[model samples]
Target chain A: DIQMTQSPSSLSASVGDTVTITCQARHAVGKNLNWYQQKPGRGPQLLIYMASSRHSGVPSRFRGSGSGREFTLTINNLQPEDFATYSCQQGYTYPWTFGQGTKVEMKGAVAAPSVFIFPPSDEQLKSGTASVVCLLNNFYPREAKVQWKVDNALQSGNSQESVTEQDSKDSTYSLSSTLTLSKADYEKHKVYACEVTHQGLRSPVTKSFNRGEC
Target chain B: QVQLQESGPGLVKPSETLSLTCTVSGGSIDDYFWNWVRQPPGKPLECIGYIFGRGGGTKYNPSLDNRVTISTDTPNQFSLKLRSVTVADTAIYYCARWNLYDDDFGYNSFAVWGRGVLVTVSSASTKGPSVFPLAPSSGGTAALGCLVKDYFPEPVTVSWNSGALTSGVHTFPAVLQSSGLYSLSSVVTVPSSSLGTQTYICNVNHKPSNTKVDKKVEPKSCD
Candidate 1:
């Protein structure tokens, strides 16, 4: 499957400020890139199709450009109603995929999360299998992304995330993700990293765990 | 309030004739032209032919003109017959009422359509296409072959990486084997520079049973 990577996973921009979100395909997708606007409580609406063609009824302010493996979506004169999630999708091949979305938010409304990765417990490791947990707390907007990598390679194991929990004091959201693997597989890797992306951060935050750290 | 339903055997042996009937309800069959249409899975619709119920005027698709027949012998019902069926004939058959301008028989359109019925043309000897490991590259070029054997069907689609390598792809005609089955070979030539540096995949699609098989040449030195 072709993987899609989006830059500035999430961003904070004020209304009327033009913003650009970029997507990179691991393989060449030609002009098959599409841009979509997804507001809360509604399905995504296609803004641009075939890289740069504006969809029917879409505002001219929304523009898509670039081709091959790199594409960008630019929104000019952003409105308050446009302060939502925007994502890019590729239709060039089977198993079409979407990017991790760029969240357009009101400036100064962002709250960065504190990320932590807990190593497998000794008791759990002794059972011939173990699980590591990555937790993020005090994150605003309730939208966050988590990815697990082992020895610099992406891991697609039985990793799952908990439902978002809101803190009573600050009303910020918290989330935890867990990746479980057998002891043999866990010990075979040197480092396991948890990378988190949020609107409040300029870049992704990553925490790593060394083998046998528990 | 008008309704149409298609009824036929779900399976037919290859080389045998296929028969289907369309029963009309809440409408008189004598009022409109009865038409037959079919669609293979994931393909476009094909108009087989149409027959006027009252005057017996008939028109068949030029592609199937020789082997297809449409008849309306009874009231409120019509039938279709296709001879020497093959996997290409496997499809969902739909019966529709075609509305036409009475003066010149022009401006015709399908006004009513039946819930289609799936009909598969297959036999016990039917088999899907299979891919063998790619042969090594030679002289800066690599030849990728997909082998389809022991199949009763005649046609199969062989593509490289879905839609790439269109220029260097060639699919030979199917050959009859002594076992009364068919075998076919499709080959694609690619630059040897892309052999180990990039991945090449072969996709075989047999539409009869809707079977698809994919194989890839591992990114390693093809030499």
Candidate 2:
């Protein structure tokens, strides 16, 4: 397994911008290097193999160059959907290894999330349980961690988080976390909080829901 | 909308030739590159070779190049012939389409894959592996090579004992020798600063015979 190192772990670019990612192998791997593109929730798609030979169906804009330990993958006239992570793999020897990925991001300032907590719906309460929903909307960079707190203590095992959804228009992201509680337990707890931590925010944002406030 | 399906004999005798064919459907066989890839029971995929549908030019895995041939002379299909078969050649073989552009420059992915066919080579004798001490390399970094040879059957596991291992290790595939045995080599690279402070151990496991061998390489001064 030859060690592979990638540079510019991440970068920001616009729809029409061009960007290049580099990978270096510890030893000479000849032209056995391969490049892949990975989008959210999808398997990595091979872009180039044998150093510079582009795989079939891949656009000509995605070009690969270099050989013998050093390689480059350059995307020309980047498209909106091209903003994802790219990786390099070496096939010259056994235990084929991959480089730590390089992520292509949308260029601009990050957008902090707007947090809101919704009370359990009537249908949900009819089942002798309450399901509270915490929604985080309009965040950039598409990644955020959410946690639930009941009366300031951490709550676990009764919550489910949704996969991040991208807004087609703004390209921002939204996510929701649901906490289910028994009717008796919901009344016993005075306050429920939804805490969201995102790279766009200097500090985590917390929105609490009180029974009487509704 | 293109599809591929692999067809071949499920069983083959050792020291014989193994033949397989891939049938193309819903598209012309003259469109893309046809490839043969195989995976032994628990091993990773190994690329055997590929043939251009239009020109019939071919490229093969260097390790198996001498015994492997990929061609497409039949209508709507291509074929793979591997000679001098052994138990190591047993695998589930797949046929896939390697998409390309009009100019022959295209994405390097196996875009469409065939449901593979399992091909097993009959039983064969096994031989335990022999491990050799690590040979140190003279350089700024402390690089060492370990050799394991004279093993029958393929697919051996190799590991090292070092605080900073794994990432710096490179193991080559088992290569068959003229004596009807297999040989493998692994190299480990470590920072020169840790040379004299730590000893490195190379571990080899041959699964068929349940044989395990470990060789230790003593540390040397940075001088």
Candidate 3:
């Protein structure tokens, strides 16, 4: 799971200023949670909990709100330096599950650009029974391709194979394809790889899977 | 800086159950990671995994990691569950407010180590874990066998202080044969510490996942 960390791009400002912290998940932890805060150094500060519950000690201006994997942490008014740092840690899974932090400052909060390391979408997962979906979000319009590579060889399918492209950005040019692979061919013995030919990218990116049964 | 306290039973009989809980005192369970670490007497500490907060998320260590569940009740108390314990699974257990950031570079050496409570395995004897010595070797450039209880894992470095091996040292392979028995051997030219009736120690270095990971903790489990 790609967990993002964002702090206001600006930090220098007078008191009574506003600060917001935001985070984006590369994948879904099942829309589990989001959090916001107004914290000071060496935090253990509890400004908001469960993406919305505010602590009694927190100043009334703090706000935590969001749905899905995207969350925003907002501070209505900033104090001199307020001398605080904020972070977005995921309550999703273990290990690579937490984000160190993101800080807010006087340079005037810098709006951070959302990144592309999102988790595999449920829609794509649902689209296939014995199929596979390529996470091509990291790549833009300049480069993208879907090719079937078996045994490391690119084939045009004299037997059974096809491709479908879906518009990702404008609904006119993105792509998603499902191939109806024969049960015997898929299960008996062969490694099926999803190959993507894209520019600015080297080599054919492939997802390799061994035949399930003997 | 949040405070996490671990509490639970001190002993678990083999084939029974071993359970523990960690109580967080400074922060809400909304973000940080809750982790479980264990030290078998004199062995190095091993990390279990990260905690998923109020909603629930769990990750397990694949090896020697079985039937372990991590969950939270309120926003503070995190729990751990292990069923059907055996003697091979005894050790000192500790729970803490997991700093998820450390998950990547493992062995973030227990930033907050609990006052470890030893939980002896579900063994028949109350005396404590049985100690088994290394296999006998002819010494000197030959095969040297030593029993290490808290010491598991091969690719270790063994140095002798009293004799031929004082300067030259190396390690052998350690293979876990059955439930708790581990067989190990190393070929080193260093003389045995037995020269002064002294004890030779086999030191090991451990790097928790990756990082510049370059050192081993105390010889905890290598009894």
Candidate 4:
């Protein structure tokens, strides 16, 4: 029996762009490969079956082709809803297996995040405790990291992050995180900063909160 | 549109026996070959074997031979009994339809699949991980080619040798297939006299799975 594997764990593209996913069978499958599309929260739907044959009613752009060990599933002129996870399965050999799912997401312009740090109130700053919040948005790719720092040292934060979601009518995404820390650290003349690592920047974008107010 | 479903034991002891059955519905078992396919939780899918009813026979994965039996129960079902089961045999067992086609070379592939049943054994090991030597094109001299595809966990390589040909050139730097696996193809032009022995070999080595598959070829006679 042969095993199956796929590539591009996740990818991003736009409408009218073509995307191709490949499946390799450990042994000669001849033309026994199949491709499927699985939308979020839904069962997989068959897209291409029997290597080169498109399942009935499939678009002309969704094509399957290849032989022996290497097979390809190509989507030409990708439609909007086409941005879902795609998987490949081979029925040629026993223990028919599925490839790890590949996610096709919409590709959009990359932009550095706009960061904000909510300063503590004078009363809260005078006390020994306060909550620190950092809002980061206007980012693309949606993959970003947020970290809390006190006096240049990374601090364990009572931090919570959110679901990366589309920011507008476009494909870009926005996400935010909140961190809670004691104002005692702030009163110690310590600097508190939030660093955001996003695809749009080579270095992390950092924003620091104002110290005790007047 | 025959619906397929697999039913089997939820647990089996080490070195014991495991059994499962496929209940066919909406269509007769007479038309399609029924198969047992399984996947270890988060592992590769394996088609253990298939059985055709009445006139149909059975084919088993060689590694599971002597330990597996696939039998049919007349009108609507087939059974799979795997003896000497271990934890490695644990998987989500599936009963599915194997569709056969009469096309270029003998062919078959799965279509309708069952919902799958989880079978857990006491202990387990991960299952595999090959390629084929294409038939040689003959003329004044012959060129033999073979494709090595889909072998894993990784570091797959291929070699060629023959009693039928020599001085073979291989697909240098085995192509890293897009699937994160490797595939290789090699061709060797041979003297016409070399065809007399009628044999060739393509050996594929997959170290992670500890798999080494050598395909021997006996080419169809070129008239």
- How large a fraction of the reference contact set does each model reproduce? 0.00, 0.07, 0.00, 0.13
Off by over 4 Å in 2: A1-10, A38-46, A55-60, A94-103, A163-165, A199-202, B1-223
Each model's lDDT = 0.70, 0.73, 0.45, 0.66
Task: Report the lDDT tens digits of candidate 4 across residue range B172-205.
Answer: 3343333444444434445557767545676667
Candidate that scores best on lDDT: 2
**Which CAPRI category fits model 3?**
incorrect
lDDT of 1 by residue, A1-214 (tens): 5778888877766668899999999999888776767554333455777788776677898989999999999989988778777877676653345677777766654688766565554444666755666666557877799999989988785675653323334445666566767888888888889999999999999988676543
Model 2 C-alpha lDDT per residue in residues B14-52, reported as the tens digit of each score: 999999999988886886668887766534356688887
Give the CAPRI rating of model 4. Answer: incorrect
Off by over 4 Å in 4: A1-3, A116-135, A155-168, A176-192, A208-214, B1-223
lDDT of 2 at B128: 87
Residues A1-214, candidate 4, lDDT per residue (tens digit)? 4777887787888789999987887778778787867654344556777788766567899988998899888999999878888888877655566787778888878887666555444433454555455555456877789898877877764655553435335566554454546666566755778898887898987877445431
> What is candidate 1's CAPRI-style docking category based on DockQ?
incorrect
Per-residue lDDT, model 1, residue B163, is 83
Error of 3 at A163 (Å): 55
**Separate DockQ for every predicted complex:** 0.01, 0.03, 0.01, 0.05
For residues B71-172, what per-residue lDDT tens digits would candidate 3 score against the true structure?
788767878787788765677676755434523211221234345556666333221111122221122221222222222222233333333343323233
RMSD vs true structure, all candidates: 21.8, 23.8, 20.9, 26.7
Alpha-carbon error at B76 in model 3, in Å? Answer: 13
lDDT of 3 by residue, A59-110 (tens): 7777777756677777777764354555454445543343445545333222
